[PDB]
Amino acid sequence: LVNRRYTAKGKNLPSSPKKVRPIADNIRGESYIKAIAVLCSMPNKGAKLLEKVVKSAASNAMYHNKNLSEDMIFVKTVMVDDGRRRKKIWPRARGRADRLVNRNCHIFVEVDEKK
RNA sequence: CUCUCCAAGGCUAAAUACUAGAAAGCUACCGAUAGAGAAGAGUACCGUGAGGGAAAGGUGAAAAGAACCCCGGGAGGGGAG
C-alpha cells in the first residue's frame, strides 16, 4: 500500500508505545499544518518524537515531488509499533529484587497530497 | 595305616588392569535449552573461606561496510550506488 517514496520511519525511539499512541490518534488524518501545530504545542515526549518523524516524512515527500508545498500535505497514515526492551534491576526490601523494563517504539508516518 | 610335599631365605618377563593424555581413524553418536560446565569459561557473578557457577553460534559467494544528495543535534530514515 505504501508509497515508500513519501514516508518516514523512526526506529527504537525512547518512549513507550502505550504513551505515544494517543498523540498519534490526535493527528491522524489532519492537515500537515494542523498536525505540526498540535505537536509543537502539546508538551509530551511522544509529541516531540512524532514531530521529528512527521517533519522528516514531509521533507522526503517535498524533495521527491518538487511541486508539493507545506499546505497540500496531510498526514495520511500513522503507525506506532513497539521496539526493543531493556531490563534493569530495582532492588527492594529484604533482599528482593525486581526487573524494571524499559520500552522503545517504532514510528511510521506517511503523508499524502490533500484531497 | 597309607598316600603326597619339604616351611620358618630372597628374586622373575609375558598373558592382566588403566589412558589424564600424543598420533591415525570409526560411528543406525550430539548439531547450539542438544553435545564436555565451557563452539567465547571455570570467565562473569555469589561466598570470609572451603566451594558453587552461568548466559551469549549463523550478513553475503566475495565488504563489494552504503561515494554523494535530502530531513535530523545525533540516532534513525528517504534517494542514489
Curated annotation (Swiss-Prot):
GO cellular component, one term: cytosolic large ribosomal subunit
Subunit field text: Part of the 50S ribosomal subunit.
UniProtKB keywords: Ribonucleoprotein, Ribosomal protein, RNA-binding, rRNA-binding
Molecular function GO labels: rRNA binding; structural constituent of ribosome
Function field: This protein binds specifically to 23S rRNA; its binding is stimulated by other ribosomal proteins, e.g. L4, L17, and L20. It is important during the early stages of 50S assembly. It makes multiple contacts with different domains of the 23S rRNA in the assembled 50S subunit and ribosome. The globular domain of the protein is located near the polypeptide exit tunnel on the outside of the subunit, while an extended beta-hairpin is found that lines the wall of the exit tunnel in the center of the 70S ribosome.
Name of the protein in question: Large ribosomal subunit protein uL22
Keyword check for Signal: no
Disulphides: none
